[PDB]
Amino acid sequence: EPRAYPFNDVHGLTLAGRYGELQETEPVSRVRPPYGEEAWLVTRYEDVRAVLGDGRFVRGPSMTRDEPRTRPEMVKGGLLSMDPPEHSRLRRLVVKAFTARRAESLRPRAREIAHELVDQMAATGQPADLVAMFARQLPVRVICELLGVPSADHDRFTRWSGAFLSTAEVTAEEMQEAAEQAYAYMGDLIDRRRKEPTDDLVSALVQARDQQDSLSEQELLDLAIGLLVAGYESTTTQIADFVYLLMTRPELRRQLLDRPELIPSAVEELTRWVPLGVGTAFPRYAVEDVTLRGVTIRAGEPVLASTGAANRDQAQFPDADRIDVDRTPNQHLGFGHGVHHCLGAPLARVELQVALEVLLQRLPGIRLGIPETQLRWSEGMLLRGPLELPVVW
Numbered sequence: 001e002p003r004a005y006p007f008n009d010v011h012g013l014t015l016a017g018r019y020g021e022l023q024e025t026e027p028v029s030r031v032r033p034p035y036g037e038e039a040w041l042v043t044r045y046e047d048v049r050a051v052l053g054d055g056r057f058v059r060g061p062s063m064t065r066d067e068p069r070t071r072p073e074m075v076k077g078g079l080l081s082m083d084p085p086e087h088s089r090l091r092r093l094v095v096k097a098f099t100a101r102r103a104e105s106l107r108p109r110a111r112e113i114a115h116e117l118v119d120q121m122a123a124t125g126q127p128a129d130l131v132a133m134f135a136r137q138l139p140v141r142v143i144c145e146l147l148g149v150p151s152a153d154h155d156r157f158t159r160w161s162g163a164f165l166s167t168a169e170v171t172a173e174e175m176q177e178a179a180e181q182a183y184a185y186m187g188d189l190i191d192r193r194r195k196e197p198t199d200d201l202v203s204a205l206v207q208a209r210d211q212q213d214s215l216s217e218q219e220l221l222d223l224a225i226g227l228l229v230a231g232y233e234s235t236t237t238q239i240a241d242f243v244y245l246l247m248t249r250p251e252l253r254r255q256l257l258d259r260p261e262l263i264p265s266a267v268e269e270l271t272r273w274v275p276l277g278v279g280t281a282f283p284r285y286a287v288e289d290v291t292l293r294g295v296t297i298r299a300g301e302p303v304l305a306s307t308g309a310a311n312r313d314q315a316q317f318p319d320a321d322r323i324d325v326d327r328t329p330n331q332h333l334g335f336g337h338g339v340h341h342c343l344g345a346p347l348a349r350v351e352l353q354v355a356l357e358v359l360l361q362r363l364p365g366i367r368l369g370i371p372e373t374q375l376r377w378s379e380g381m382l383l384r385g386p387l388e389l390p391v392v393w
């Protein structure tokens with residue numbers, strides 16, 4: 001009676017038709033995931049937003065529950081495993097340092113990196129793999145700039161970081177070795193910065209105070225690694241997916257070449273439209289019985305609040321399946337909602353905007369080097385995107 005879940009096919013960005021049918025007939029429904037417990041699935045924009053904003057729906061039980069999921073291992077902890085007040089405290093300290101102004105201050109460096117990456121692509125000649133040469137490189141290098149990793153260390157830092165991607169084909173031990181290198185490295189960088197602060201985010205996080213409170217040694221380190229993993233694969237996959245869409249929908253590419261000022265609005269529209277998740281990770285747990293759409297979610301039950309379906313809800317977004325780069329209003333949930341609302345979203349916006357800006361400026365004829373039906377899609381089962389994007393220009 002619960003439906004097998006996920007509904008999305010990983011081999012593309014299509015939004016499963018089941019979502020729409022549930023938004024109509026059964027907006028709070030039961031699902032059976034590949035691993036973990038059966039759960040409620042919530043699919044209407046209004047309800048998804050209500051769930052993510054509601055104090056009765058928490059993340060703490062993640063730590064001691066068999067979470068609905070698509071992979072056998074569970075990845076636990078981070079800010080997203082915490083609830084107020086402990087969550088509020090850490091978030092207050094982080095946002096104090098990681099401000100929208102810091103995010104925008106990185107646009108010039110983000111563009112310089114994007115141009116170097118395009119130089120490297122042009123230097124090896126068509127076809128180049130946009131995924132390996134650009135999408136997997138820009139967001140970790142920008143995180144390097146953000147944190148304060150000295151330039152000479154960007155290559156080894158990038159190399160360790162690649163082992164954390166869900167698409168990586170490394171043994172357990174290899175990934176383990178990259179994880180120890182990155183922790184050790186970040187720990188030392190934090191300690192330098194503490195005694196000799198610069199202008200980078202690690203310096204500002206060490207000096208962040210909130211009515212006499214500060215981040216502990218371990219907190220600093222877990223938060224810095226936490227930003228790395230939250231900010232790398234997401235951004236990488238979304239760059240790949242946006243460019244795949246640009247290269248396969250000529251009217252989208254023509255609109256942005258003609259009017260590059262539309263790039264920020266287009267980033268928002270594609271963040272809405274792309275159901276980036278294979279499913280919905282990060283189940284919330286009811287702290288008490290909650291009745292939603294006349295159905296009672298009981299205390300302790302997991303609830304998957306689908307931002308992919310919510311962002312494509314016809315009740316909230318006129319002609320929701322149309323990509324309209326000027327769409328307004330566009331109050332999408334592509335960066336989340338409520339206390340866990342993506343804290344890197346200003347910088348993600350900067351990076352996505354820069355990626356499209358530089359690629360379009362440098363390679364206005366960029367297009368697929370192989371037929372669309374021949375693309376290989378990631379089977380990492382967390383996010384959807386192409387494994388390789390051979391491009392010509």
Ligand SMILES: CC[C@H]1OC(=O)/C=C/[C@H](C)[C@@H](O[C@@H]2O[C@H](C)C[C@H](N(C)C)[C@H]2O)[C@@H](C)C[C@@H](C)C(=O)/C=C/C=C/[C@@H]1CO[C@@H]1O[C@H](C)[C@@H](O)[C@@H](OC)[C@H]1OC
Pocket residue numbers: 073074075076077078079080081163164165166167168170171172175179226227229230231233234382383
């Ligand atoms: C797709 C995005 C996520 O990717 C992930 O969740 C990454 C998952 C990969 C697939 C895992 O690696 C796999 O583990 C298996 C046991 C073996 C398998 N191989 C080697 C055959 C291997 O590929 C995990 C265990 C990798 C380790 C290094 C890890 O902790 C990765 C963390 C990355 C988390 C990524 C970011 O999500 C963040 O997860 C945190 C737990 C949350 O608190 C939150 O913010 C910090 C969230 O981002 C919003």
Ligand code: HEM
Pocket residue numbers: 079080081091226227228230231232234235238276281282307333334335336337339340341342343344345347348
């Ligand atoms: C296109 C790129 C990105 C997308 C689509 C994205 C999306 C999201 C979403 C939907 C959430 C909320 C998850 C939930 O509530 O279940 C989230 C949380 C988070 N994101 Fe992002 N994100 C992106 C980039 C980034 C970047 C670049 C960073 C950091 C530099 C970042 C750091 C974080 C952190 C630390 C959280 C958890 C916040 C908390 O629990 O308080 N994200 N992101």
